[PDB]
Amino acid sequence: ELTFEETERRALLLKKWSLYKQQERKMERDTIRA
Amino acid sequence: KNILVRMVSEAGTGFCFNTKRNRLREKLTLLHYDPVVKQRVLFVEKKKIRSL
Amino acid sequence: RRTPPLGPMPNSDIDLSNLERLEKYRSFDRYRRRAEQEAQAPHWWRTYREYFGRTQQLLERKQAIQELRANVEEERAARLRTASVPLDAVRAEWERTCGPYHKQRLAEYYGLYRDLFHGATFVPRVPLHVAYAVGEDDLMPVYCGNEVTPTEAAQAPEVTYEAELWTLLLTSLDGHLLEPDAEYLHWLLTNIPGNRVAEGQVTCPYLPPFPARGSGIHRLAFLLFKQDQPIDFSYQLAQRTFRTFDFYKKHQETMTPAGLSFFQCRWDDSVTYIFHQLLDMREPVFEFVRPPPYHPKQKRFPHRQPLRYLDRYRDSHEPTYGIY
Amino acid sequence: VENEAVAPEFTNRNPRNLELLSVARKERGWRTVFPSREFWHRLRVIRTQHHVEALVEHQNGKVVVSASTREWAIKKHLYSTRNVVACESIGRVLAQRCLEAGINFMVYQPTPWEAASDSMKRLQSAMTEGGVVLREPQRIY
Amino acid sequence: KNLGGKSSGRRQGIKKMEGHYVHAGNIIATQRHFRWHPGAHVGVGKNKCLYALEEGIVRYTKEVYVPHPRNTEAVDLITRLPKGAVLYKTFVHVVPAKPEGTFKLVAML
RNA sequence: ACCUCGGAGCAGAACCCAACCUCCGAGCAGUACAUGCUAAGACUUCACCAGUCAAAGCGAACCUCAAUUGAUCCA
RNA sequence: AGAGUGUAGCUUAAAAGCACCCAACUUACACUUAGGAGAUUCAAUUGACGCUCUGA
Ligand SMILES: [Mg+2]
Ligand SMILES: [Mg+2]
């Protein structure tokens, strides 16, 4: 079983990881093109 | 190989329809529409007309 | 013989030996999108359609969206698929911002413009809230093409057009019993002093809708015209006949169509009373008659035809005996 | 009586007359192509990258009604315009617009995956509870 | 050594060319494969024959081809098609001539 | 050697085309038991026989395969 | 010092569509479903904040 607070923390974890790896892939592609 | 079998209505009506089945499968029972009763009733294989 | 194509053949520009290199539709969805776009695009070959066919606003909207994003409860509900929307507020904002265009689309679909104004269009900028008072407690609203029974429309409606000289007209577009290209005028309040409607001039008294039985669904339109400058206007059915196109041709300079609202009515018991008492006539009853079934010319020898062939061409089912 | 002068044949010019009487033709062909044209009104849902569109379109192609998350009125009351919440909200708004427009029946033609989608299920439920039956009456011949 | 091949011609093909008035139920074209695809107001029989579902005029057109999502072979062909490509097929259409019916005054109650 | 039936060339494009011409095949199988009843309009192997498709309707649910067969009489 | 100038990666898009990413189904990819971020450089058509090119 689980709780609402940890579910919300997990959702925010997914959100921030999405942003972080989006920036990672963006910088990788920038280096590739450069 | 298959055999032609007369499926007879269990509704008591003399309604018979011929179907086919494997000669090695068990005697066959269906839910077939009986026009006399105007309803799907059980039909049970009665006799083997011929071997097809 | 090989007549050359009369234009760019489809799948011509893309066609190239580098099929392996070219990216492909990996999804039926993207293929369908492209195919639909191509179908919409015009073509030189025979096709189905031929035969059957500011900055402040942006800033404020961005700030509002940012505030909604910041609101944690909103995000919690969104990710828990439990958030809802205020339907009434959405309706009001639709009216204020983009309601006129969708209402214009509805009117065009219903054929109001092609009939009321013979094709000429106009955006109903001014929202028009019309409601037929039902009982002494409620009132059926007439939004756009909704269904309101003549029983409910027995008494004249309450109109609240928010503005600050107006003319309101109720016109039945397809209720005319004698002339296909004619309308019926029901009530015309002209020179209305702004929002309040009780002070308008009663050019024509209110006549409730009377869609004949078995005559189908009839469409009635509330036309609202802003009156630049006040102007003068000029139970018998011949005088209730009305061509809105001619009327607006006469009053075009001083009138501008700024509001629209229509509803659909079918026959009801109240129509009988309207016909018998108010109009003092025998109510007409119409029926939908399909064309008679087609049969090929009867042959002397209907070869290979069933016995029903002769029944297809006999008129009377009762036995006949000729001379006997 | 002069007022009793009625033409023998009535000419109802309302486009929706026969459709509402359930007598108008509805294209029965296109049995080898998708979607089927056998309808008077179709609910077409377009899920873009950022936005969700829900149109009620007549067989002739005229978009009778529309509900897009790209309108300010709707987009200013929900968090994300590309989620199940957005689809449910646009479905309810479209149901209200259809009821006020007189459109009570439609023919939804989703692909297998679209039908299995949770968002499409929510949109269909929203329309049903709003008062639109996604199954047009059979034509009367 | 070579036996058979004595079958006669099926007499298949188009029975109603474009512009021909067609009554409901008339067979427009008989085909062994899908040469002409069904269009508006045209139905397909079990043997792929196209019959008129309405009374009107036959029109042949070229229209984009969008198979049913459950037609696995066609969906696979599409999935392998390059982007920008659109399939086209010949479709048969019946432009209905007469209206569904007319409203007639039946009784002046 | 063949005799009936179907697919492909000859017969490139509506239909149709011979050959003791070139090649492939068939004389089933499988799934279901509304593979129920009726009924406009059409197709048709160049006749007939036979063979095909089918709107609408009643009643119900919410047929694949090219051939895959055979009349009358009589049992 | 001068020229081209200028919407998130792309758009003879006008704040959109394609793009793009992780989660699940996939060995994997792909599809599909769920979600994610995103811009019209700043002031009155004009001037000046940033990029490219031509030079030293
Ligand atoms: Mg041959
Ligand atoms: Mg013949």
From Swiss-Prot, chain A:
**Coiled-coil regions listed:** none
- Where does tissue-level expression of this protein occur? Ubiquitous.
Location comes to: Mitochondrion
Q: How does it assemble?
A: Component of the mitochondrial large ribosomal subunit (mt-LSU). Mature mammalian 55S mitochondrial ribosomes consist of a small (28S) and a large (39S) subunit. The 28S small subunit contains a 12S ribosomal RNA (12S mt-rRNA) and 30 different proteins. The 39S large subunit contains a 16S rRNA (16S mt-rRNA), a copy of mitochondrial valine transfer RNA (mt-tRNA(Val)), which plays an integral structural role, and 52 different proteins. mL40 binds to the major groove of the anticodon stem of mt-tRNA(Val) in the central protuberance.
Q: Which family does it belong to?
A: Belongs to the mitochondrion-specific ribosomal protein mL40 family.
List the protein's name.
Large ribosomal subunit protein mL40
Which organism is this protein's natural source?
A: Homo sapiens
Q: Which residues of the full protein are shown?
A: 105 to 138 of 206
Swiss-Prot record, chain B:
How is this protein annotated for GO cellular component?
A: mitochondrial inner membrane; mitochondrial large ribosomal subunit; mitochondrion
Q: Where in the cell is it found?
A: Mitochondrion
Q: Name one GO molecular function term.
A: structural constituent of ribosome
Q: What is its main location?
A: mitochondrion
Which biological process annotations from GO are given for this protein? mitochondrial translation
Presence of the UniProt keyword tRNA-binding in the record: no
Q: Which residues form the signal peptide?
A: none
Assembly information from the UniProt record:
Component of the mitochondrial large ribosomal subunit (mt-LSU). Mature mammalian 55S mitochondrial ribosomes consist of a small (28S) and a large (39S) subunit. The 28S small subunit contains a 12S ribosomal RNA (12S mt-rRNA) and 30 different proteins. The 39S large subunit contains a 16S rRNA (16S mt-rRNA), a copy of mitochondrial valine transfer RNA (mt-tRNA(Val)), which plays an integral structural role, and 52 different proteins.
Q: What protein family is recorded?
A: Belongs to the bacterial ribosomal protein bL33 family.
Q: What is this protein called?
A: Large ribosomal subunit protein bL33m
Swiss-Prot record, chain C:
Write out the coiled-coil annotation as residue ranges: 54-82
Answer whether the UniProt record assigns the keyword Plastid to this protein: no
Which domain of life, per UniProt?
Answer: Eukaryota
List locations, semicolon-separated.
Answer: Mitochondrion
Ribonucleoprotein found in the keyword field: yes
Gene Ontology cellular component annotations, sorted alphabetically? cytosol; mitochondrial inner membrane; mitochondrial large ribosomal subunit; mitochondrion
Q: Which GO terms describe its biological process?
A: mitochondrial translation
Q: What keywords is this UniProt entry annotated with? A: Coiled coil, Mitochondrion, Ribonucleoprotein, Ribosomal protein, Transit peptide
Q: Extract the Pfam families matched here.
A: PBP
- Summary of subunit composition and partner proteins: Component of the mitochondrial large ribosomal subunit (mt-LSU). Mature mammalian 55S mitochondrial ribosomes consist of a small (28S) and a large (39S) subunit. The 28S small subunit contains a 12S ribosomal RNA (12S mt-rRNA) and 30 different proteins. The 39S large subunit contains a 16S rRNA (16S mt-rRNA), a copy of mitochondrial valine transfer RNA (mt-tRNA(Val)), which plays an integral structural role, and 52 different proteins. mL38 is located at the central protuberance.
Family as reported in the entry's similarity comment: Belongs to the phosphatidylethanolamine-binding protein family. Mitochondrion-specific ribosomal protein mL38 subfamily.
Q: What is this protein called?
A: Large ribosomal subunit protein mL38
Organism expressing this protein natively: Homo sapiens (Human)
Q: Which gene encodes it?
A: MRPL38
UniProtKB/Swiss-Prot annotation, chain D:
**Similarity field:** Belongs to the universal ribosomal protein uL18 family.
Instruction: Please identify the protein, giving its name as recorded.
Output: Large ribosomal subunit protein uL18m
The annotated subunit structure for this chain is: Component of the mitochondrial large ribosomal subunit (mt-LSU). Mature mammalian 55S mitochondrial ribosomes consist of a small (28S) and a large (39S) subunit. The 28S small subunit contains a 12S ribosomal RNA (12S mt-rRNA) and 30 different proteins. The 39S large subunit contains a 16S rRNA (16S mt-rRNA), a copy of mitochondrial valine transfer RNA (mt-tRNA(Val)), which plays an integral structural role, and 52 different proteins.
Signal sequence bounds: none
Q: What GO molecular-function term can you cite, just one?
A: 5S rRNA binding
Question: Can you name a GO cellular component term?
Answer: mitochondrion
Keyword Ribonucleoprotein part of the UniProt annotation: yes
Q: Does the keyword DNA-binding apply?
A: no
> What is this protein's function per UniProt?
Together with thiosulfate sulfurtransferase (TST), acts as a mitochondrial import factor for the cytosolic 5S rRNA. The precursor form shows RNA chaperone activity; is able to fold the 5S rRNA into an import-competent conformation that is recognized by rhodanese (TST). Both the cytoplasmic and mitochondrial forms are able to bind to the helix IV-loop D in the gamma domain of the 5S rRNA.
Name its cellular compartments: Mitochondrion
Q: Which cysteines are joined by disulfide bonds?
A: none
Which Gene Ontology terms describe the biological processes this protein takes part in?
mitochondrial translation; rRNA import into mitochondrion; translation
The record lists the organism as: Homo sapiens
Residue ranges that the Swiss-Prot or TrEMBL entry lists as coiled coil: none
Q: Which UniProt keywords apply?
A: Chaperone, Mitochondrion, Ribonucleoprotein, Ribosomal protein, RNA-binding, Transit peptide, Transport
Question: Highest taxon of the source?
Answer: Eukaryota
